[PDB]
Ligand binder design. Structure first.
Ligand SMILES: [Mg+2]
Ligand SMILES: [Mg+2]
Ligand SMILES: [Mg+2]
Lengths: 254, 258
């Protein structure tokens, strides 16, 4: 669609800015929670580019106050830099994430890793794509064959998290913690990891990636197996078999 | 030096092979060496390329290579130590964090190291006494002095020692701005050497996983110990790496409650 094209172009322009900045006025928004000039410039670019094409739409953006659109039915949801801490450390693993929400549903999503030039896209009913080729969740059925990605609390819920990690670690070929959220969901949708779980995530961390995984033939629930992801701010994602096995592993001993 | 030049060229040629194979993973024969411990045709071809290049250059040197039997050199005092693919599980899953690692051991000491991530074209090199380099520019460990500012990389057991690991992780997780688990060993050490992470710890690593990386971190102004703070790394098969401040605070955090 035209709107997907506009989203893709905004993400890639912001991504090129991030790549220039990668090769900065940092501040703390909260404990271990960073924002830099790179995030701010990416978000300006995305706001300006999307505005030129769909001036009627609303904007929910990580780094600035929400903008209400003239068209009450549509808003872009923007993470201008998923993996800020990675970026600031020179860890070449981070992404731009843009979703479109129409009448309370996520209908388009773009996640772009500009370091590796990896473009993940999905529209409601279109399937997931990686660099213009269809992609799907992995077909693994046993946890012992799987690599599972995770997000960790650092510097609330550490004890519960460590129970979950214990249960999953005992059963899988690998755990990964890359430091992103959107890109981790894209990696599940593209079959690069077999599943993902995390808590304390914002709407912009997850919106594009939830759609991606679902369009890729996978399943996404909150940590309780329900569909209250944005309110609960937690997630389990994977193919039908792995998602349920993860949900079971996560609850053992809780 | 001549020998670093040869090592770099071997690593980069292997790296080119790996990038080629990375585009066609499903056509690679893959076997288990142990629970969750994979080797593929890509590892073996990388190793072939490295052996073919290095042995041409130094035919009397020994080779200690992950995927094949050790070759005792006719020169008893020198051997290459090779991990032809650091991050095999990542590689097989299409995850872009993996590296080739080559070190040179002379008279029991590691004297040169190359770690190359061919996806991102990241070349880390060091020779004993001469400092660490990242893509032809000097690099160095980070300047961070407090855990709360740090990102610490870790390696896990998966599919012995899980409980002890979870104590260590609990202790570090409570103190830092971030934990990372990338799925490599050599490349993690290179990231500490270049100041991209602030520290690293892991157990059950082999000589080829760490030889080049230990030199890298030391030449980058950092410090590397076993988990008890000594220098028995290859025997104990464990490691803590970081700048002087962070490595000691990690060692203390790892022992709390044990
Ligand atoms: Mg962000
Ligand atoms: Mg956030
Ligand atoms: Mg290997």
């Amino acid at each position: 669609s035209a709107v997907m094209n506009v989203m893709v172009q905004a993400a890639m322009k912001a991504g090129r800015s991030l790549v220039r900045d990668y090769g900065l006025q940092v501040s703390l928004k909260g404990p271990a929670d960073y924002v830099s000039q790179a995030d701010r410039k990416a978000e300006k670019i995305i706001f300006n580019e999307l505005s030129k094409a769909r001036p009627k739409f609303g904007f929910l953006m990580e780094e600035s106050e929400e903008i209400i659109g003239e068209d009450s039915q549509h808003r872009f949801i923007v993470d201008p830099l998923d993996g800020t801490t990675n970026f600031l450390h020179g860890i070449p693993f981070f992404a731009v994430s843009i979703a479109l929400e129409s009448q309370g549903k996520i209908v388009a999503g773009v996640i772009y890793n500009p370091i590796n030039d990896e473009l993940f896209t999905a529209e409601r009913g279109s399937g997931a794509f990686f660099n213009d080729r269809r992609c799907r969740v992995s077909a693994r059925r046993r946890l012992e064959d799987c690599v599972i990605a995770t997000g960790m609390p650092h510097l609330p819920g550490h004890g519960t998290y460590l129970i979950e990690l214990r249960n999953v670690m005992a059963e899988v070929s690998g755990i990964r913690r890359f430091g992103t959220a959107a890109l981790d969901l894209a990696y599940v949708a593209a079959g690069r990891t077999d599943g993902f779980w995390e808590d304390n995530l914002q709407i912009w961390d997850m919106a594009a990636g939830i759609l991606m995984v679902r369009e890729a033939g996978g399943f996404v629930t909150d940590k309780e197996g329900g569909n209250d992801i944005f309110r609960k701010k937690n997630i389990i994602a994977g193919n039908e078999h792995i998602r349920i096995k993860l949900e079971r592993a996560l609850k053992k001993g809780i």
